[PDB]
Design a protein around this ligand. Structure first.
Ligand code: WML
Ligand code: BR
Length: 133
């Protein structure tokens, strides 16, 4: 019942500073432009201890499945090969990606009727707001 309030189908409704976040992570120009235009649907489900998060857009369809606290391999939408760990911290899903000596954190939280995604790399934050589809 750990993630019940996250489960469902969510659609992107607003983005701020995402291009700059992608620049900080190292995403190249053409990927940034195409990715920045996307309006993904995020589909979150839980089966037992396994959480699955899908992102589906004209840019890319991605999928991760994981157990909280248990590291896994992820290929990101921009094709980084990262080691990821997702935990729950005070009701916030905290997703840390490590690659090439670098780190970025993506936080997902329920706030009112929204699911708010905060992507942070060094001093650059991007906020992406999703609502139920
Ligand atoms: C090239 C983009 C790399 C960073 C993606 C970060 C976030 C994510 O975790 N998944 C995802 C996948 C595709 C696109 Br476009 C945007 C997102 C973001 C979000 O949920 O809105
Ligand atoms: Br996307």
């Amino acid at each position: 019942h750990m993630c019940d309030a996250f489960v469902g189908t969510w659609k992107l409704v607003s983005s701020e500073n995402f291009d700059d976040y992608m620049k900080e992570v190292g995403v190249g120009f053409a990927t940034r432009k195409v990715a920045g235009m996307a309006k993904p649907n995020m589909i979150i489900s839980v089966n037992g201890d396994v959480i699955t998060i899908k992102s589906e857009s004209t840019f890319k369809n991605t999928e991760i499945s994981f157990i909280l606290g248990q590291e896994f391999d992820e290929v990101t939408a921009d094709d980084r090969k990262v080691k990821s760990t997702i935990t729950l911290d005070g009701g916030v899903l905290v997703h840390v990606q490590k690659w090439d000596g670098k780190s970025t954190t993506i936080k997902r939280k329920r706030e009112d009727d929204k699911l708010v995604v905060e992507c942070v790399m060094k001093g650059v934050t991007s906020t992406r707001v999703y609502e139920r589809a």
